[PDB]
Symmetry: D3
Subunit: 278 residues, 6 copies
């Protein structure tokens, strides 16, 4: 259903952002940095044997006390690499990264101004665990999470690599004219009833568009895209990917919908991060 692959690879649409895009975000982060982070780790009761689990409390947007999980694999190593993973379920749903030898910080998004700020702070919280190797802090997400990660790749001093799967929050004006699926269809359904608010909806969403963070992000990244994904259509993902200003690679799954590369792509990430961190 979207542009052919030859053209997706060369797709660089005109970007829309306000003159204050950077002033808005610098100011948002400054406001929330005025409160100390005060990370608190609580060991939690778990049936898990290969992993230790912590309930983490930290200061996010405007000093509010947010929480995340910290999953630490039981390994000899005094210092471990770390994946901050954005979305929740159970701690046992996040076993992949710890099982591959990474500490995993799992943060649920509890508007985007608040969520992105919380997420930036989550990296700071993870970094503050003494076992975490700060040179190997990775940020990751798929869908809404991939969109959030992508923003964080431009906003976080501490993050060192990005794993961005099938991201949402990318190239809003194009998404809306290609698919009638949730979540992009919420915008369309808003505009259907507020016919006079097209300029303001899109000017507002421009502050949260992944394409605009991508153009700014300088850290290495691995993207994934499903060529049959009609939740997060390929032209949206390729727009962000192609504008992404750091060293990058994309794994293209031509027969997949929004599941993306699934478990195959998980292994690709492990391989990518291994090559990166040696």
């Amino acid at each position: 259903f979207d542009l052919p692959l030859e053209e997706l690879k060369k797709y660089r649409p005109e970007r829309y952002e306000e003159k204050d895009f950077d002033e808005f975000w610098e100011e948002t982060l400054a406001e929330s940095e005025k409160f100390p982070l005060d990370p608190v780790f609580e060991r939690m009761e778990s049936h898990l044997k290969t992993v230790e689990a912590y309930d983490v409390t930290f200061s996010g947007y405007r000093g509010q006390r947010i929480k995340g999980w910290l999953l630490v694999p039981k390994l000899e190593e005094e210092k471990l690499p770390c994946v901050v993973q954005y979305i929740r379920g159970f701690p046992h749903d996040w076993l992949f990264w710890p099982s591959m030898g990474y500490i995993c910080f799992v943060m649920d998004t509890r508007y985007y101004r608040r969520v992105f700020t919380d997420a930036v702070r989550a990296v700071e919280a993870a970094a503050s665990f003494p076992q975490v190797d700060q040179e190997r802090i990775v940020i990751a997400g798929g869908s809404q999470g991939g969109g959030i990660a992508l923003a964080v790749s431009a906003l976080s001093k501490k993050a060192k690599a990005l794993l961005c799967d099938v991201p949402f929050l990318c190239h809003f004006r194009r998404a809306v004219q290609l698919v009638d699926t949730h979540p992009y269809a919420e915008i369309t359904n808003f505009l259907k009833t507020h016919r006079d608010k097209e300029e303001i909806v899109f000017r507002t969403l421009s502050y949260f568009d992944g394409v605009n963070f991508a153009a700014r992000a300088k850290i290495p990244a691995l993207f994934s895209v499903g060529l049959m994904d009609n939740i997060c259509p390929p032209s949206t993902v390729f727009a962000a990917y192609n504008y992404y200003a750091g060293p990058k690679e994309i794994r293209i799954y031509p027969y997949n919908n929004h599941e993306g590369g699934g478990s195959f792509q998980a292994v690709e990430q492990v391989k990518f991060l291994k090559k990166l961190f040696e």
Copy 2:
């Protein structure tokens, strides 16, 4: 076609639901004879350590003899723990080894078998023997587990395997065929219906044949402790089919009921319930 919400018998009645069973006079002879035939080939389990990015778990590519001696495949996932003897879950479905991290992460060796039902059930009985042959496996704590088609398979195995010690049976398929068919238009039970739509004269023979694979009939025979789960909005494996099997199940048993879930069942919540159940059982 999908039911809107609750569509089967109410819960008060599901708990008392014990329909008449149908089986042939030779049900036991058929399965004894099938297993004897396949035991005439040596199991010859082969475990190959695999190169893996996994750090908490060691992974083996397993080959073993199943139905009529055919070389079947499985994964073995062993969590890296001090213990010289570990408990073991044989899980029926094979994707990546990293898809099966749950049980190893909870301290269980995990044997994952790659999956007509004559062949599959025999393969599955043999997978337990394969798993038991790993020296680190504690044979007093071998568990059999499955959801859907896997759950139906596990249920059969609970009645056919000398070696299995406990059953985890989630939202099982292969149960109470005659009723499934008159409640749901969903795959997989709808394959039976579509067959009968076209072969109008084969009702007796379709149901007599299926009786040999019906989980209700194995349940009536199974003596090992078991934990079942069911989704009351499950329109793939409707609740009356699962409750039929659960209620006939002849070993010590419990069921977790998920009133708002479709075929996902209790999902991750139920995974924890299984860990708790097995802990209480084996301590």
Copy 3:
């Protein structure tokens, strides 16, 4: 989804009809009999080898010239039994079943029910006028809308001798509408959704065309069929008409079938039924 079978077999709901149900139909047929039938059979050029095909024209409702096909199997016999089949009338080769089993087949093109039923009663007269047709063995047949039509004809035609009625539409309207949301019964429901004040008049009008009310009148032998998963023509509607049907009768029950009914299996049942009947 409907009543269980034990109950379907005993299901006899109260009937509704207007005081002039019979006068209405008598009068409708008399009006259309005031024009001569004037059946015209034209041999058609056909690729068919086992069958001869005629383009038929005859006078139906109010004298309008209706069209049909006649298919005659090439057989020794000077006199052949005949099935009048109701459905448009597609190709002659679509109607090979009955001729292939040794029956002349008259296939009537459908074109409101006042007209269609009248057209259909006249089709039997057209078919009876073919010299090779044995008038003692004229059968009327239809499935769906056809079955409903055939059912009406079983009560309105002097000439018809047996009925084949499969999964019939036009039966027990008020119950249908409260069991299924499928076309065609859902047209009634959608009308009433919008015309909330027209319930009485819709149902009274439809009572003139309800197969249950014809069934109560029909005296000729009949074979019905029903699919227990049929959500176009639900089982309780078919069983209502079947149970009220006043002639010698049988029903074939297909428990796993939807509106396809007994399909090809049922087609053979019909052949068997008619063979047993006409010896």
Copy 4:
């Protein structure tokens, strides 16, 4: 099509109610907290293309003193006191022409449920503060989410004099969830599908907002409507509320309608009801 209890049984359906010991204390306290801020209604005449109606942008204090908005539509009639319908949903002022056209001043409030119900109670107080409003003839009305809200307001507002409750949402949550997979009741289900351990707390929390519990308390006259094929707000949910409703009451039943209810037919029924009531 029909999927809920039959009508005989719907009319007698009175399920056990669940509410917390503090249901009344919770609401008394919520309203007291919001009454500690002055209402301070402000009416701004608006430039409008309308010729039969005058339109005001209304600002008032709702929940916790927040400045809420509504429309006031006044029909141009040479009467100094008019009856009034407070209608809960805000689109254009021209979307709300029905009540003004029937001679009623119409207050349309732009609409967690703690905040919304409190805002809605205060919208009556805002409407009553318009000098042209006849306080003896203040009516509260809603369909869907609006009907639920109106139902709560019928129990919580000193000032309201009658209730028009169509196809209400926010009723008999535990039952809705086990009958339908449609939005909005399916949000509850989708929550519980994921938070399997939160059934008791979800339903105890929702008990503070259940229309059945407000209905048991409401003393003002009311006209309800229900669609027997409504799978958004299933009939057993509406009938539970209707049957527990403690004021003088009537229900209009639309057997062939889904969530559209009686539509325009029902609108006229309301006009008739209110006319009979207020004379």
Copy 5:
């Protein structure tokens, strides 16, 4: 978005197909129906409405048959009022918009297209005959099937002065059929699926009723609307008619809407358009 992009829709002028007798056919159709006197009859109706007077209208349409309509007159000082003939008839209260904006509203009950278009041309003449109607300000209006009808009327009526045409059906048939599988254009497709040999005759027949061909003839000012996600009446069909439309014109484009079009927002655009036009 599934049709041509907007830059290309604005320039879209496909080849038109009409028969050599398009004009003779319509002239002759209207002459035939003018041979019967219009004989408009207005009956004041008992109504709960207070801002509007309602009349039950009867008039002679196609071939002299007595067609029905509603006339809604807003109670205003003015001795002469402008008038919107609206094509679709439900309740009078469903048509409050135009009277509430100061326009008399003639709502015509739609009952083939030969008959409906002729009825609709005659409705304008019926409306014009009401003494309070200002004949210099008679507007014709419709959405969907109504828009298609209004469009025809814009070319066929001596007395109409402006056109409001929203999301019209009956436009650029051959293209519709290859873009969408939705009702109503899919009735054409389903016919052709079965009558494979009737392509020429189906399209030649439909050419007499195609809005594109009327548009090319219509000389009165018009406001069109289109939804760029409308898959009932696809944008390329509407733009074909709009672009051929031979009078002074404007189009309001709603990029995120389906067949609802501009809805209430577009209703206000019409009021504005007509105000600017008539002063």
Copy 6:
């Protein structure tokens, strides 16, 4: 509605073919292997209510000598020799296959991995040809959908077949089908690849042995194809690829408003006409 290439472009659509270097060795070898067992056709007259047609239950050896079943329907006509349609598909009831016998053709209906099925189908022609009343100069092979795909393969593999009727065929231009439609049966391939992301090359190389396009390029017998321009089971660009590569004398009937039903009863008559013009 219309979702594939336009017609002007469908008519010129000749995509690059892919096949393995052993395509022909594979099929020659497969057929030789199955010819090493004797056909041994057995015709049993069946009790039938039919009066214009005689019906036989047929048994014959197909793939690797397995005993396959078919129906033979013979119209009761004076003629000592009759033309024959081998029709590929339940083989349902004998009465479901009345069209061809009614038009004066003997009909062999075969009850239908593809290696096995194609071999069975090639052998069905030999079974039909062994009936003494069959005219071997007028043996026709026919199928729609899966049947049309099978018939297409048989048009290249059978010494005995003389004409092909290929309607809305499945098994054609796999790599394109998969990127145009999400319908069964082509969607089984897509679903396989969604899960086995590393098996694209081997899936498509394997399927190349069964692709109707590749048989078409080889088939030398005359043929009538049909296509539905709204067919989203067997999309038009797949059918046109096979049709356009088809190397024998050919025609195609194009049904612009039809989905997978194709030309239906109208096309049936087109076939009769085609075969009549051909065999005189």
